[PDB]
């Protein structure tokens, strides 16, 4: 669950090649397509009638940018994920009412996107590293729930 130093390096190295806005928009759109009950939070976002409508939706895209931007910044704080996400955890629980299972679903979708985007570069050990990170972030964001 810890990351090893080589795991940290591998995560940093891959993430340096990521277009965060693009990966964000695609990860969020895929969440809403693959697990369409996650759409419950986004009735104000307009057209989500079809897979193409969700993926093309600029409000979905904007929200993906926001979420993955925060994720990205969090990668600078792998040693202190709970501290770094605490206030976001409080907000998601107290104001947004987001079931933390949604974080784990998004982590699954993120891993699939990275695998699609990077192909063979997203090796089994690199995936193992990312699976620790997405676990860590989801835990951090769920930590202040009560």
């Amino acid at each position: 669950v810890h990351l090893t130093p080589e795991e940290k390096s591998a995560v940093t190295a891959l993430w340096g090649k990521v277009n965060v806005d693009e990966v964000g928009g695609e990860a969020l759109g895929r969440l809403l397509v693959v697990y369409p009950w996650t759409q419950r939070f986004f009735e104000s976002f307009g057209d989500l009638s079809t897979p193409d409508a969700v993926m093309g939706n600029p409000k979905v895209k904007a929200h993906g940018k926001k979420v993955l931007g925060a994720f990205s910044d969090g990668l600078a704080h792998l040693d202190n994920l709970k501290g770094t996400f605490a206030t976001l955890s409080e907000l998601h629980c107290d104001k947004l009412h987001v079931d933390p299972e949604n974080f784990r679903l998004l982590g699954n979708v993120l891993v699939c996107v990275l695998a699609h985007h990077f192909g063979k570069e997203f090796t089994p050990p690199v995936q193992a590293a990312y699976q620790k990170v997405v676990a860590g972030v989801a835990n951090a964001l769920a930590h202040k729930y009560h």
Partner: protein, 141 residues
């Protein structure tokens, strides 16, 4: 999935519950909210304090749905169809939460059925609640 013996066990247990079904439904929701605080994310509009009329009213509805299931045990998808629609389409409760409420329903039954809640009946009830859960999430995608 549910054997003749499972169906018999479920009906015997739910038979003994009888008119307390509503009460036990509310007690199960309460157990869930306290034990698994993340489930409260679905009820931001509810007063969830002990004795809440909202929790009692919802407990009765959940109980009545289970009674309907039990009565239509060989035809549960159709019995619960409108509820599957409602959970899949509107409420959009993450599927993981159904196992939490099922567990708390199991615990409630246990706390109230000293004679009935045998190992065998426990096993059938767990199966029965898993089946209900499956039907209720069956239209999610």
């Amino acid at each position: 999935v549910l054997s003749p013996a499972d169906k018999t066990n479920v009906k015997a247990a739910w038979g003994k519950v009888g008119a307390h079904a509503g009460e036990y439904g509310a007690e199960a929701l309460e157990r869930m909210f306290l034990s698994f605080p993340t489930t409260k994310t679905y009820f931001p509009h509810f007063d969830l304090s002990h004795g809440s009329a909202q929790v009692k009213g919802h407990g009765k509805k959940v109980a009545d749905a289970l009674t309907n299931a039990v009565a239509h045990v060989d035809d549960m998808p159709n019995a619960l169809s409108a509820l599957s629609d409602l959970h899949a389409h509107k409420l959009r409760v993450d599927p993981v939460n159904f196992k939490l409420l099922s567990h708390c329903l199991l615990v409630t039954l246990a706390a109230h059925l000293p004679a009935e809640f045998t190992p065998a009946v426990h096993a059938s009830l767990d199966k029965f609640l898993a089946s209900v859960s499956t039907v209720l999430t069956s239209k999610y995608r």
